């Protein structure tokens, strides 16, 4: 593998996680699990950085905004903490269903392979052709744009996704830290914790 990415920086694992036996399993599936975890963390961090950029300014959706434009517009995080419990619960449940669909090795075997104990290219959301729903389009490329593409372009995009995911992980961590302790940049608002809060306990 050797993870070309940045040619000057080869490997880099003080923690020797690469030659590991996570949950008493083989090394290859361990490397696959770490690759899937870092790719998912990168994707989530990129989405969170774009969401924080869009929520710092009042850019709420003007479609109806019955509850979106209700409060005012505050601590980017608070924005989340002000929203009702049903909204965040449905968001969490939809993410849980999407990741349950991602790991389903019957649909995956109909499409590709799973990350551990198989080939399983790290990061592959399967299609929506098996659940009892003619959904308009799948999660990966809903509006068909990359239907026909070169494999070399796909590999370059995967490397770019990994690198930009690490960069935006650093960026989102920096923004979240500057929300509570100003490291190196101005233009923060306040600290709005991290968990759900607002109700339950």
């Amino acid at each position: 593998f050797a993870k070309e990415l940045n040619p000057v920086v080869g490997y880099w694992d003080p923690l020797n996680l690469s030659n590991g036996e996570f949950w008493g399993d083989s090394n290859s599936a361990t490397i696959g699990f770490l690759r899937e975890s870092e790719i998912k963390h990168g994707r989530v961090a990129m989405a969170g950085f774009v969401g924080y950029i869009v929520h710092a300014n009042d850019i709420r959706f003007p479609w109806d905004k019955v509850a979106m434009a209700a409060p005012k517009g505050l601590s980017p995080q608070e924005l989340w903490d002000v929203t009702p419990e049903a909204a965040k619960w449905q968001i969490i449940l939809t993410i849980a269903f999407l990741e349950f669909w991602r790991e389903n090795s019957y649909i995956l075997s109909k499409e590709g392979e799973q990350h551990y104990m198989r080939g399983g290219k790290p990061g592959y959301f399967p299609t929506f052709s098996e659940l009892p729903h003619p959904v308009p389009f799948n999660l990966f490329d809903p509006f068909g744009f990359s239907k026909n593409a070169s494999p070399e372009k796909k590999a370059k995009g995967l490397l770019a996704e990994v690198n930009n995911g690490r960069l935006a992980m650093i960026g989102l961590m920096g923004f979240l830290s500057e929300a509570k302790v100003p490291g190196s940049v101005p233009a923060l608002a306040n600290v709005g914790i991290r968990p759900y809060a607002g109700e339950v306990m």
Partner: protein, 215 residues
């Protein structure tokens, strides 16, 4: 019969035979494995049927919907979503309902009436949830429970099998939904969706009758 549990693929693909608490063998009362899984299938189907009926009854009781000329309509017209209007019923009527259910299950599970119909007990090589007809001791008794008007007297085996899979699936989902209702009634817990504002039966849902009957 252990490999006859491959019907869970037909119930739902992807998630196939899913038994973490591996009750597939776990010999019950010293019986064989096939008898144990037959008991499991019959208990699952019975729980699903009662859960579906209880769900519909929960909706009815929450939206009142009383009988027209019933003189047992002396129960309060507001009423908790369900467990108080069960509690407001006199104890003899609850006892008669329970005895009715017991009589009907003892009818379902007698081997004389089952083998006369032509189908054995559910742990002796029979379909779980069959409920035979009435060859009763002298009692004409029109209308058995299953399709009394005859809505499915003629039916292909594929349609019956699909209905059985649908029955099991809807039974599982109705168990989940009915206990979501009962949870939102007592120590809510189902704050997702809130279930649609059910007051709160402070008492125990598992407490039949007003009196304790010392048992």
């Amino acid at each position: 019969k252990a490999d006859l549990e491959a019907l869970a693929k037909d119930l739902n693909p992807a998630v196939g035979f899913w038994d973490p608490l591996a009750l597939s063998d776990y010999s019950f009362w010293g019986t064989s494995q096939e008898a144990t899984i037959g008991f499991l299938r019959e208990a699952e189907i019975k729980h699903g049927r009662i859960a579906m009926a209880g769900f519909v009854g929960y909706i009815v009781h929450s939206n009142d919907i009383r009988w027209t000329f019933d003189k047992v309509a002396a129960s309060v017209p507001t009423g908790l979503p369900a467990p108080a209007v069960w509690d407001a019923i006199p104890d003899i009527a609850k006892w008669q309902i329970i005895l009715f259910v017991g009589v009907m299950e003892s009818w379902r599970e007698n081997k004389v009436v089952l083998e006369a119909e032509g189908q054995k007990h559910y742990m002796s090589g029979g379909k779980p949830g069959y409920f035979p007809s009435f060859d009763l001791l002298p009692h004409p008794v029109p209308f058995p429970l299953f399709d009394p008007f005859g809505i499915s007297k003629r039916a292909t085996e594929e349609k019956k099998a699909k209905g059985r899979l649908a029955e099991i699936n809807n039974g599982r989902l109705a168990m989940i939904g009915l206990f979501g209702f009962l949870s939102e009634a007592t120590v809510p817990g189902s704050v997702p969706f809130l279930k649609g504002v059910v007051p709160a039966y402070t008492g125990e849902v598992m407490a039949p009758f007003t009196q304790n009957i010392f048992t």
